[PDB]
Amino acid sequence: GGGILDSMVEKLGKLQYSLDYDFQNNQLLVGIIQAAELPALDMGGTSDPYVKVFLLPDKKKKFETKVHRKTLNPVFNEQFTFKVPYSELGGKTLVMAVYDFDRFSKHDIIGEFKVPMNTVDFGHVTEEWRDLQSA
Ligand code: NA
Ligand code: NA
Ligand code: NA
Ligand code: NA
Ligand code: NA
Ligand code: NA
Ligand code: NA
């Protein structure tokens, strides 16, 4: 069953987020809440996680949480706002990507996932845990 095991979702941790569309101010609100069970490094190391948060296909610069040093279970508790009228949302996709900050080399991705806005349930707050997907 090795081929089948290789196809399984790898244990790269999970991110909890929330989402709500503010119809008063016409903006998408995103909560980056916390991550859990991020993978250990070699030599028993922990990573320095942060999250990038952004819409596709939009080309504007990505939002980022603070970096949380030396933790596999960070609590971010950050909010981000996207000023996009509802009518223009559905064709877009929200991306959340967790990276390992390093000062001296490329920041390795830990993993990512995507939320197409056309299967967002508008008008109720969305909150879930999502397994980070390999990249
Ligand atoms: Na696997
Ligand atoms: Na694998
Ligand atoms: Na493999
Ligand atoms: Na994975
Ligand atoms: Na997983
Ligand atoms: Na995972
Ligand atoms: Na956590």
Instruction: Determine how many CB atoms are found less than 10 A away from the CB of residue 29.
Output: 15
d(CA 37, CA 108): 17
Q: E-assigned strands of 42-134?
A: 49-56, 63-64, 75-82, 93-100, 108-116, 126-131
Q: Does residue 127 fall inside a structural domain?
A: yes
Query: For the chain, first and last CA: distance in Å?
Result: 23
Question: 6 C-alpha vs ligand 3 centroid, how far in Å?
Answer: 6
Domain that holds residue 102: 10-135
Give CA–CA dist 122/132, Å, rounded.
23
Q: Which technique was the structure solved with, according to the deposited record?
A: X-ray
Rounded Cα distance between 105 and 110, Å, is: 15
Q: Is residue 5 part of a domain?
A: no
Distance of alpha carbon 135 from alpha carbon 123, whole angstroms = 31
77/105 Cα distance (integer angstroms): 27
Q: Give the distance (Å) from ligand 3 centre to CA of residue 3.
A: 9
In this structure, what token pair is assigned to residue 30?
A: 């995103």
What the block records as the tokens of 103 is 């000062």
Q: How far is the CA of 72 from the centre of ligand 6 (A)?
A: 12
Residue 106: CB atoms within 10 A of its CB come to 8
Give the count of domains, the chain: 1
